[PDB]
Design an enzyme around this catalytic site. Structure first.
Site, PDB file in Angstrom:
ATOM      1  N   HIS A  71       0.804  -1.220   0.000  1.00  0.00           N
ATOM      2  CA  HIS A  71       0.000   0.000   0.000  1.00  0.00           C
ATOM      3  C   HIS A  71       0.836   1.270   0.000  1.00  0.00           C
ATOM      4  O   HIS A  71       0.262   2.359  -0.041  1.00  0.00           O
ATOM      5  CB  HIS A  71      -1.018   0.010   1.159  1.00  0.00           C
ATOM      6  CG  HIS A  71      -0.452   0.256   2.534  1.00  0.00           C
ATOM      7  ND1 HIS A  71       0.332   1.348   2.851  1.00  0.00           N
ATOM      8  CD2 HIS A  71      -0.650  -0.410   3.701  1.00  0.00           C
ATOM      9  CE1 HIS A  71       0.625   1.321   4.140  1.00  0.00           C
ATOM     10  NE2 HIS A  71       0.040   0.266   4.679  1.00  0.00           N
TER      11      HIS A  71
ATOM     12  N   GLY B  78       3.663   6.517  10.162  1.00  0.00           N
ATOM     13  CA  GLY B  78       4.960   6.191   9.609  1.00  0.00           C
ATOM     14  C   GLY B  78       5.583   4.932  10.168  1.00  0.00           C
ATOM     15  O   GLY B  78       6.765   4.678   9.913  1.00  0.00           O
TER      16      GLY B  78
ATOM     17  N   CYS C 131       4.500   1.827   9.488  1.00  0.00           N
ATOM     18  CA  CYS C 131       4.339   0.710   8.569  1.00  0.00           C
ATOM     19  C   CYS C 131       5.694   0.233   8.068  1.00  0.00           C
ATOM     20  O   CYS C 131       6.610   1.031   7.839  1.00  0.00           O
ATOM     21  CB  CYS C 131       3.438   1.116   7.399  1.00  0.00           C
ATOM     22  SG  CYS C 131       1.706   1.261   7.877  1.00  0.00           S
TER      23      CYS C 131
HETATM   24  C1  LIG Z   1       1.523   2.754   8.804  1.00  0.00           C
HETATM   25  O1  LIG Z   1       2.302   3.611   8.564  1.00  0.00           O
HETATM   26  C2  LIG Z   1       0.149   3.105   9.331  1.00  0.00           C
HETATM   27  C3  LIG Z   1      -0.073   2.602  10.766  1.00  0.00           C
HETATM   28  C4  LIG Z   1      -1.305   3.463  11.412  1.00  0.00           C
HETATM   29  C5  LIG Z   1      -0.966   4.748  11.429  1.00  0.00           C
HETATM   30  C6  LIG Z   1      -0.753   5.208  13.030  1.00  0.00           C
HETATM   31  N1  LIG Z   1      -1.352   4.326  13.803  1.00  0.00           N
HETATM   32  C7  LIG Z   1      -1.744   3.088  12.877  1.00  0.00           C
HETATM   33  O2  LIG Z   1      -2.353   2.097  13.317  1.00  0.00           O
HETATM   34  N2  LIG Z   1      -0.892   2.545   8.452  1.00  0.00           N
HETATM   35  C8  LIG Z   1      -1.881   3.413   7.813  1.00  0.00           C
HETATM   36  O3  LIG Z   1      -1.850   4.564   7.997  1.00  0.00           O
HETATM   37  C9  LIG Z   1      -2.966   2.815   6.923  1.00  0.00           C
HETATM   38  C10 LIG Z   1      -2.684   3.021   5.450  1.00  0.00           C
HETATM   39  C11 LIG Z   1      -3.771   2.253   4.649  1.00  0.00           C
HETATM   40  C12 LIG Z   1      -3.469   2.373   3.147  1.00  0.00           C
HETATM   41  C13 LIG Z   1      -4.475   1.564   2.312  1.00  0.00           C
HETATM   42  C14 LIG Z   1      -4.534   0.102   2.771  1.00  0.00           C
HETATM   43  C15 LIG Z   1      -4.816  -0.033   4.276  1.00  0.00           C
HETATM   44  C16 LIG Z   1      -3.815   0.789   5.110  1.00  0.00           C
HETATM   45  N3  LIG Z   1      -4.248   3.442   7.285  1.00  0.00           N
HETATM   46  C17 LIG Z   1      -4.874   2.989   8.536  1.00  0.00           C
HETATM   47  O4  LIG Z   1      -4.327   2.157   9.180  1.00  0.00           O
HETATM   48  C18 LIG Z   1      -6.217   3.557   9.065  1.00  0.00           C
HETATM   49  C19 LIG Z   1      -6.863   3.031  10.156  1.00  0.00           C
HETATM   50  C20 LIG Z   1      -8.008   3.739  10.395  1.00  0.00           C
HETATM   51  C21 LIG Z   1      -9.123   3.576  11.502  1.00  0.00           C
HETATM   52  C22 LIG Z   1     -10.298   4.518  11.519  1.00  0.00           C
HETATM   53  C23 LIG Z   1     -10.388   5.582  10.496  1.00  0.00           C
HETATM   54  C24 LIG Z   1      -9.308   5.719   9.445  1.00  0.00           C
HETATM   55  C25 LIG Z   1      -8.083   4.728   9.436  1.00  0.00           C
HETATM   56  N4  LIG Z   1      -6.971   4.619   8.611  1.00  0.00           N
END
Ligand SMILES: *C(=O)[C@H](C[C@@H]1CCNC1=O)NC(=O)[C@H](CC1CCCCC1)NC(=O)c1cc2ccccc2[nH]1
Ligand SMILES: *C(=O)[C@H](C[C@@H]1CCNC1=O)NC(=O)[C@H](CC1CCCCC1)NC(=O)c1cc2ccccc2[nH]1
Lengths: 302, 299
Positions: free
Chosen positions: A40, A142, A144
């Site tokens: 992603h 950040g 991930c």
């Molecule tokens: C990795 O960098 C982050 C980890 C998140 C961010 C901080 N705390 C966490 O748990 N992952 C993300 O930001 C994902 C990116 C998505 C891209 C498309 C495919 C799925 C992952 N976004 C989310 O994790 C996320 C969770 C969430 C819950 C409620 C509303 C919005 C939302 N976005």
């Protein structure tokens, strides 16, 4: 006198790099001449809703991936997808590549997480894979591409790569071959974890660690039957106790003189009436993130 | 929210094995010096009343066997600084990180890398208790294991492990060999003072719970600092000082909850307990996160 201990992280620290695609920056894992990271990373805000990853990747090129190890830029000479993980091929093999394997863990097993930001390790902690296939992590934006691992002798067993955050606050990811743990998908959409349960065999292991360390008050003379304990387990949302579990606890039942079904009666009592005003190993709840092997490892110093 | 340790790689590259007589323990190899506890030179006859200056002057360089991995370091000379022994070797550790020696104060946190025979075993986070002990996880042969913090890429070593007290808590020195607390390196009966809860740390953790989205423990009351301390001391909590109040200012500003309003909430939590609920996964009030730790993990 009993603590949640993570593995020493040195062998993994040397593998963490930073990966940027467009406006997204996250972490990659650099082993031999490949960098692994969540697929992603190629998503924009308008693709996160319902991505078509095959079509997104075909549009990307080698030079849309900026990979930096420290302050040395790694040139990407190829890219491919395996399930939910992106494989970026780089010109240079990592000279710090340790002996390693990719392994898929089971719910109830534990591992260490190396949380990273911008390719830089920032903290390490011990986790369990919950029965509902989430992990109760601590993660910021950040994070991930941070990985979870176990160490065996000199071989690093990589088991987890971090992808996302569920609206309940728990976390979800894949193994290093890109297969998700649990019924989750990598798109921004309504996702909820199943009802969690408590890892029964780990609670029992921890109660044995308390005995070993000099807490003995919850012990009692009564034994019980596996059939009768599992009715109590069902009511209090504990995983069923199998006969494999009883065998696994054999080495701790021997060293302390307490049979598993006796300790189960102690655990039954704690579930019914509570702890009646006490703590166990400095906790006021029943801990389930120590495996039988963990208890030995810490009580023996491997 | 988790008890998070620092990545241990910079410290792993410095751990060696030190053997004297029939005693083996761990040493910290930095530049061309290996630091270890001076009680490595005691025999079974020397543990109640050692005279360390007399035991050391009788030793020759070759009496100390130092091993980095499977390579043996040659000891060039030796000297004692307080309760740590400094072995000069002919090879500077090529993996020596940027480092400093610091002495910490009660309430402050650090990571411990538990080691046996020079080999790292596990890492965990820890706090200097107000009675100058630490609640570690240590087995036989763990002496010489160190505590540390990392800032940027600089390792600040603050603790080296020496002994185990009858209550099962642990005592040690800084890297200049001065003990934390009133303890000495003799196997005489030694008393850990009464321990107490690190109040400023508990408050910072409550602020962390507000930042992470739990408000259930707040109430409509406030308190004077004086009235708060009169109550807290009846639960064996440490006095809260004006310094502690100032330290919490930043977190008070993030959350919009005044420090003395949060003290009122803690006064009520001590009175009521949790009533079945939990706070950041715990059913007790946690006192091993500092105001600094809370900011780093939450932001
Ligand atoms: C990795 O960098 C982050 C980890 C998140 C961010 C901080 N705390 C966490 O748990 N992952 C993300 O930001 C994902 C990116 C998505 C891209 C498309 C495919 C799925 C992952 N976004 C989310 O994790 C996320 C969770 C969430 C819950 C409620 C509303 C919005 C939302 N976005
Ligand atoms: C280092 O290897 C050990 C760490 C101990 C081992 C068990 N749990 C720990 O924290 N340190 C020791 O064994 C010291 C040995 C030296 C102490 C200072 C004087 C010279 C020897 N001894 C103890 O830690 C010890 C002995 C003892 C006897 C009775 C009650 C408590 C107790 N603690």
């Amino acid at each position: 006198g009993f603590r949640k201990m993570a593995f020493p992280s040195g062998k993994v620290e040397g593998c963490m790099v930073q990966v940027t695609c467009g406006t997204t920056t996250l972490n990659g894992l650099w082993l031999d001449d490949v960098v692994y990271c969540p697929r992603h990373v190629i998503c924009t805000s308008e693709d996160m809703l319902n991505p078509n990853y095959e079509d997104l990747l075909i549009r990307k090129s080698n030079h849309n991936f900026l990979v930096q190890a420290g302050n040395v830029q790694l040139r990407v000479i190829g890219h491919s997808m395996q399930n939910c993980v992106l494989k970026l091929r780089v010109d240079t093999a990592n000279p710090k590549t340790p002996k390693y394997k990719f392994v898929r863990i089971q719910p109830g097993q534990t591992f260490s997480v190396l949380a990273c930001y911008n390719g830089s390790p920032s903290g390490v902690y011990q986790c369990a894979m919950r029965p509902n296939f989430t992990i109760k992590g601590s993660f910021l934006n950040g994070s991930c591409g941070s990985v979870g691992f176990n160490i065996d002798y000199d071989c690093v067993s990589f088991c987890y790569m971090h992808h996302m955050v569920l609206p309940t606050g728990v976390h979800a990811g894949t193994d290093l071959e890109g297969n998700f743990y649990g019924p989750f998908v990598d798109r921004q959409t309504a996702q909820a974890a199943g009802t969690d349960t408590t890892i029964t065999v780990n609670v029992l292991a921890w109660l044995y660690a308390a005995v070993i360390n000099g807490d003995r008050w919850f012990l009692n003379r009564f034994t019980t039957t596996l059939n009768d304990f599992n009715l109590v387990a069902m009511k209090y949302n504990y995983e069923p106790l199998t006969q494999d579990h009883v065998d696994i606890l054999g080495p701790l039942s021997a060293q302390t003189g307490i049979a598993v079904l006796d300790m189960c009666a102690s655990l039954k009592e704690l579930l019914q009436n509570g702890m009646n005003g006490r703590t166990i190993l400095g906790s006021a709840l029943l801990e389930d993130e120590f495996t039988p092997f963990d208890v030995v490892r810490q009580c023996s110093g491997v």
